[model samples]
Every structure is written in structure tokens, then in C-alpha cells.
Target: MVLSEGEWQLVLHVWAKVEADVAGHGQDILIRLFKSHPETLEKFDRFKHLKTEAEMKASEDLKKTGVTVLTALGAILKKKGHHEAELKPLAQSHATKHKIPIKYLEFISEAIIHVLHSRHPGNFGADAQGAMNKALELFRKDIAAKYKELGYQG
Candidate 1:
């Protein structure tokens, strides 16, 4: 889906803000995200093990490219139907490849921080909730109009 200028801009902000944190611990992230948003699990499979180093590496590479795509998707979705519809396939693939459940994918940014806390007890310093909420807020704002268009309060 092609992004509108505003969607593209907001997504760029979301992508850059999230990229580093997610890459730091994508595997654990998948787990926590699933734990937090189990409903997403219905959309994809759950693997028996964590992703391999090679797989993780490939994912890291994809993360770079995905940033661009997500930004574009956000832009496009902001102008039309939430392109999350289109992105969901890639998201499902990422979950399957990483042994992450589809449910976890729903948590998005917050789950990234949750995984971080789970992995490093006190490393994130102040609660990352504020930052995570901000991300979610931006996310909702970007998608809300389209969601409303579809008769959703989401």
C-alpha cells in the first residue's frame, strides 16, 4: 500500500524510535508481546523454540528494510484502510520465523519494553511505559481515522 505524506512521516518517527530497542532483543520481545496480547495468536503459529542466530541475523537485516516499508505502510494506511491489513502477512511470517506467536505481534512497542524488563530486571531505568504509551498513542492516532472509517473505535 502506498503511504500518504502524513502517514509516511509519522511512521518514520515510529520506526526510528522503535528500531534499536526491538533489535536489541527481538526474540524475547516476541514472547512478551504474545503474553500481553494473546488474541493475536489466532492469526499465526507458535514455534517450539526461539529463532536461530542465522534467523535472528536475517531478521535484523529485515528490520532495516521493514522500517522503510512500515513507514510507507503507515503513510498509506493513514490515507486509506489501515494498511496493517497488508502488513499482517509479513507480521505473521515474522512471528513464525522467530517462533513468536501472532498474539505477541499485537503488543507492538510496549511488548518490546516488556521483553527488555524481563531480560534485564532493572536495565531500562525509569518505567518504559511512558515511552511505550507514547508510541501506542502515535500509533492509534495514525490509524484511528481509518479505523473510524471502518466503524471501529480502535
Candidate 2:
């Protein structure tokens, strides 16, 4: 869905704050993901065996991966749905090469929402929620289709 300029502005405005502390914010997102859905770890060989919070917190790889995700989100926000250049390749790699399921891809929305809600309390509002949800849904659709073409079950 194409976002209105105001919607895009809202997303960009909040994302600027998120980028300011990308590493820490991303870490918090990942921590929420790990805590809420431990099964996600099985997809990451480096983190699959980590059974403790300290282990996850101290993981350089995890930190790097978090930054990568935040960076990707920044790129997506930058594109503002005008082109899929930034997100397409990521969706391709994640879906085809990694074979990450659509459900897990979907989980990212929740992690992001949690982070935004926690960071800004009630300030996230409906506009930001809708913007991010639509953006992620667009990504999820493309990625899921790519995975299907690669013979993934779903």
C-alpha cells in the first residue's frame, strides 16, 4: 500500500529517533524476539545454542545482526515505497537462501511494534502502526512469493 505523504512523514519522524540508537534499539528488539519467540533462534546457527540472556547480550554477532536489521529498516524507510530496490534483495536472500518461514518474517512486525511502543509509550499512535504494518506486509508478500518459487512449503 502506498502511504500518504503525511503517513510517510510520521514513519520517518519516528524512525529518525530509532536510528539514533540503532544498536541498542535493535538489541532491545532482538531481546524481545528471543524472549517472546525462542523458536526464532533455531534459524540462526550462531544464536541457536545460546540459552541465556547474558550469552545473547554479549554476542557480537547478535549485535551486528541487529544493526544490519535496523540499517535495512532505515533503507526501507528511506525508499518510502517508491521502489523496492533496498527491500527486494533482502527479501530474496532471507526467503530463498535462508528459507525463513513467512511466519517468522511476520514476527518481525511484532518485534518492531514492541520496540516502538516501549520506546515512546503511547506516542506510536495509529498512523505509525498502519505505516509500519503496511510496509512490512508488502515486504512479507514479496518474500513469501520468492520462497515459494524456491520450492518452500509456505
Candidate 3:
């Protein structure tokens, strides 16, 4: 799952670019995720209660978690597969501590692509989109694999 230097470098650019706007873009993706898969909200103990788009946008806690996720993704994306080991235990903690469903992990991927494309239809580009999908799917599988290890029945 190690990305080529070109791929990693390309992804880093967009990752950093989005950091400055996480207040808005961050909220957009998470909101896209919930709307796309409302069932995934069950995984978010804190955010599931948000009933309106305005209320969801107003939650400082939600925004903070969004930043935290972007930060974590930034760190991991920099090294590409080098940090996948980090994701397994993270996935493990998420699996054990949060009871996050395997299917819900990739909902973020859909949300991210939708938001980025909507904003940058011309600039996001195919390879960049491909690169993001590669990393995100690997991340999802890492967590999904962890759940299998624990033999999740739910």
C-alpha cells in the first residue's frame, strides 16, 4: 500500500490546503457523510444527536473532531503506508472503544470526494482523486481487518 513519492507528494498538497479551511470543508465532509449514511451516525456518540444542519455546523465539538481527524490524516498521508501500523491500533481502539462499524469507516471517503469535487471540479484532478481513494480505502480496510480479528457479529 506504499504510495509512490509522486502520489504522496500530490496528496500532501491538498491535505495542507484543506487545513486552513477545515472550519468549513471539515464540517462539509462530515455532514456529507451523515447525510449519505445516516446509520453511520450511530457510531458517533457525540455527534449523532445533532438534528439540523445549522446545529451540526454550530457544534464546536464536531469541528474540533474534524480538525483532529484531518490532523491525523495529514500525519499518516505524509508517510503514506509507512504509518499504516499506526492505523491498525487506531482502528483497534476505534473498534473496541467506540464500537465503530467496519462499513462506516469508508463513508468518510465518499464525503471527502464529494466535497472536494464540488469545490474544485477542475483542479482536484483524476490522479489526485485516485491517490486519495487509495489511501482512504487502505485505511478503511485496516479498520475492517481489525474488526475481523475481534470477530465482530454486529
Candidate 4:
């Protein structure tokens, strides 16, 4: 509600991406993410009441940020790994906000990667993965900074 400029940009970008790609698939993705990571239900179950349009927009919003997160993780995953201390808190906060378990982060991450892979499996070699990682990092960082800017305590 009280979104900052960055958060608003995230929302706008999400709307745009869904309009560009996966307009109807947004619900499918959410179902898949929840199914693959049932634990996330605890935090994100509120989405059940959201309409298709709303769900799509919200998912797009998250996806926009996901680009940043994946990029950052890829850059330093060798040393920090997926379960890095810095990243875990973000998951925890998301979990708290969405009422899901923090453990679902892996499932959510995999779901995202799988979607991209399905979109272009052959194209995602090491170099592609590297680029994707960078994208994910930028997405995450931008969204997180926006969240802070918006005063999201959770």
C-alpha cells in the first residue's frame, strides 16, 4: 500500500512482464510454487483470496525482484552457497510476511529457475546461467532496497 518509488517500479514492472509474458500463467506459477513448496503456504496463504489479476501482478512483482536475488547468489554461491547467512534473513522475512515457512525458499528458487529453463532449456548453459544469476541478484537487491524504502518491517 505505502510503496516507495522502487516498490512502485517493481509493481509496474510486474504488471508489464505479465502483460508481455505469462499473463494467464501467473496463477499456474503460484500453484506450482505452493505445490512444490507447500511449506510456503504458512506465509503466503493469504494469496488464496486474491483474484487472478492480483495474483499475477503480485507474482510478477516478486519475480522482478527474484532476478536480482538469483544474480547475487550466482556471483558468490561458491563461497556463500544457497543457504548464505545474508540471504536466509530475506527468506525469513518473506516467510513471516507471507505466512509461509522459510524452508520453501529453495523450492521457490527452483520453481523460478525451472520456469526459465522450460522457456529456454538449451539456451541456459553456463554462460546463460551466469547472466541469469546476475539478473536474479539485481532483482532481489532492487526489491529489498525498495522494501526498506517503503518501511516494510516484516
Best by lDDT: 2
Runs in model 4 deviating more than 4 A are 1-28, 42-109
- Candidate 2 achieves a global lDDT of 0.79
Model 2, position 132: C-alpha lDDT score: 70
Local error of candidate 4 at residue 99 (angstroms)? 8.1
The segments of candidate 3 whose C-alpha lies over 4 angstroms from its true place after superposition are 150-154
Please list the C-alpha lDDT of all candidates, in the order they appear. Answer: 0.45, 0.79, 0.76, 0.47
Q: Give per-model TM-scores.
A: 0.40, 0.89, 0.86, 0.42
Model 2 segments more than 4 A misplaced: 149-153
Pairs with steric clashes in candidate 1: 3-75, 3-76, 4-75, 7-75, 8-75, 33-104, 34-104, 40-102, 40-103, 41-103
lDDT of 4 by residue, 10-62 (tens): 33333333345543334444555766655454454434454444464566554
Q: Which ten-residue region of model 2 has the weakest summed lDDT?
A: 82-91
Q: What lDDT tens digits, residue by residue, belong to model 3 across residues 33-132?
A: 8778888777778878988888888999888888777777777777677775767667667767877666566678888888887876665789888887
Residue 103 lDDT, candidate 1, scale 0-100: 28
Native-vs-model 1 lDDT?
0.45
TM-score, model 2 to reference: 0.89
Which is superior by TM-score, 1 or 3?
3
Query: Which one is best on TM-score?
Result: 2
lDDT of 4 at 98: 47
Cα deviation of 14, candidate 3, in Å: 1.4
| Order of candidate numbers by lDDT, starting with the best | 2, 3, 4, 1
